[PDB]
Design an enzyme around this catalytic site. Structure first.
Site, short mmCIF file in Angstrom:
data_model
loop_
_atom_site.label_atom_id
_atom_site.label_comp_id
_atom_site.label_asym_id
_atom_site.label_seq_id
_atom_site.Cartn_x
_atom_site.Cartn_y
_atom_site.Cartn_z
N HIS A 183 36.84 45.36 45.85
CA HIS A 183 35.53 45.49 45.21
C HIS A 183 34.78 44.14 45.16
CE1 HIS A 183 33.07 48.63 43.81
NE2 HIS A 183 33.18 48.47 42.50
N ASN A 226 29.03 47.22 37.28
CA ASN A 226 28.01 48.19 36.87
C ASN A 226 26.74 47.69 36.15
OD1 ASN A 226 28.61 49.19 33.67
ND2 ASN A 226 30.31 48.17 34.76
N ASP A 274 31.13 45.69 49.28
CA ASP A 274 32.21 46.42 49.90
C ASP A 274 31.63 47.77 50.32
OD1 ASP A 274 33.56 48.05 47.09
OD2 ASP A 274 32.07 46.43 46.99
N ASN A 330 28.41 51.67 42.31
CA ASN A 330 27.80 51.44 41.02
C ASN A 330 27.09 50.10 40.89
OD1 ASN A 330 28.75 53.98 40.13
ND2 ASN A 330 30.59 53.05 39.18
O1 LIG Z 1 30.84 52.45 47.92
C1 LIG Z 1 31.68 51.61 48.32
O2 LIG Z 1 31.69 51.13 49.47
C2 LIG Z 1 32.88 51.31 47.41
C3 LIG Z 1 32.44 51.12 45.95
C4 LIG Z 1 32.86 52.31 45.08
C5 LIG Z 1 31.69 52.78 44.21
C6 LIG Z 1 31.45 51.92 42.96
O3 LIG Z 1 31.04 50.75 43.17
O4 LIG Z 1 31.24 52.52 41.88
#
Ligand SMILES: O=C(O)CCCCC(=O)O
Length: 194
Positions: free
Chosen positions: A22, A70, A95, A116
C-alpha cells in the site's frame, strides 16, 4: 503542454506500515527525492512530508501524506490550495491491484478504482478526478475479500524486486513527466518489460 507541479506519493505512516504494498507510491516519491537530492521536511500545515526542486523556472513539489491512506486528500488539498496548483498539474503515485508487480502505467482521469487514498483526493479536490496517476502494479490476491489484508502485507522478495524494477522504469521517464508530455511518457514507459 501543462507542466507537473506536485508529485504525491501515497502511503500509511508508521513502522507497522513501512515497506507494505500500500506504500508503493510513497516509495516512488522517496526514490525520486533521493535521486534529485531533495530533503523531505515534516510540515504540519500540509499534513505530510514536503519537498521542493526547481525545473524550467517553476517550483516542483513532492508530497508524502502523514495522515492515514483514507484522509490523504486533506494533505493534497492543503498544499494544492496554498500554492494554487490546479488538478491537472498533479501526479499521484499509487499501488495498483489491477497490474502485476514489475508493471507501471500512466493514466489521466477516471475512477478511484476502489482505492481509498484516490477516493479521498477526488473528494477533497472538490470532486476533480482530472489529475494524472502513476499506477505501480502490486498484483491482486484473487478474491475481493482478501484485498484489505493483502495491501497491508509485506510482499515476498521476488515481488518487492519487480516493484523496484518498475519504480526504476518510472524514474526513467521523469523528464517527460515533469514537462507534461503524457503521450511520450506513456510510449516510453508502456513498452518496458520487467
Ligand atoms: O486499488 C488498488 O490498486 C489497491 C488499493 C486498495 C483500495 C484501498 O486503497 O482502499
Amino acid at each position: 503542454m501543462t507542466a507537473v507541479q506536485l508529485i504525491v506519493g501515497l502511503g500509511n505512516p508508521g513502522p507497522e506500515y513501512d515497506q507494505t504494498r500500500h506504500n508503493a507510491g510513497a516509495l516512488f516519491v522517496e526514490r525520486l527525492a533521493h535521486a534529485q537530492g531533495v530533503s523531505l521536511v515534516a510540515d504540519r500545515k500540509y499534513f505530510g512530508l514536503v519537498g521542493k526542486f526547481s525545473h524550467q523556472g517553476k517550483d516542483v513539489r513532492l508530497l508524502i501524506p502523514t495522515t492515514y491512506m483514507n484522509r490523504s486528500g486533506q494533505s493534497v488539498a492543503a498544499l494544492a490550495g496554498f500554492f494554487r496548483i490546479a488538478p491537472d498539474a498533479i501526479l499521484v503515485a499509487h499501488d495498483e491491484l489491477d497490474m502485476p508487480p514489475g508493471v507501471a502505467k500512466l493514466k489521466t482521469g477516471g475512477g478511484h478504482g476502489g482505492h481509498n487514498g484516490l477516493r479521498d483526493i477526488i473528494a477533497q479536490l472538490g470532486n476533480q478526478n482530472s489529475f494524472h496517476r502513476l499506477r505501480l502494479g502490486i498484483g491482486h490476491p484473487g478474491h475481493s475479500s482478501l484485498v484489505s489484508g493483502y495491501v497491508l502485507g509485506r510482499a515476498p522478495r521476488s515481488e518487492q524486486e519487480l516493484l523496484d524494477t518498475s519504480i526504476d522504469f518510472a524514474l526513467g521517464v521523469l523528464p517527460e513527466m515533469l514537462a507534461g508530455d503524457w503521450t511520450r511518457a506513456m510510449q516510453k514507459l508502456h513498452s518496458q518489460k520487467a
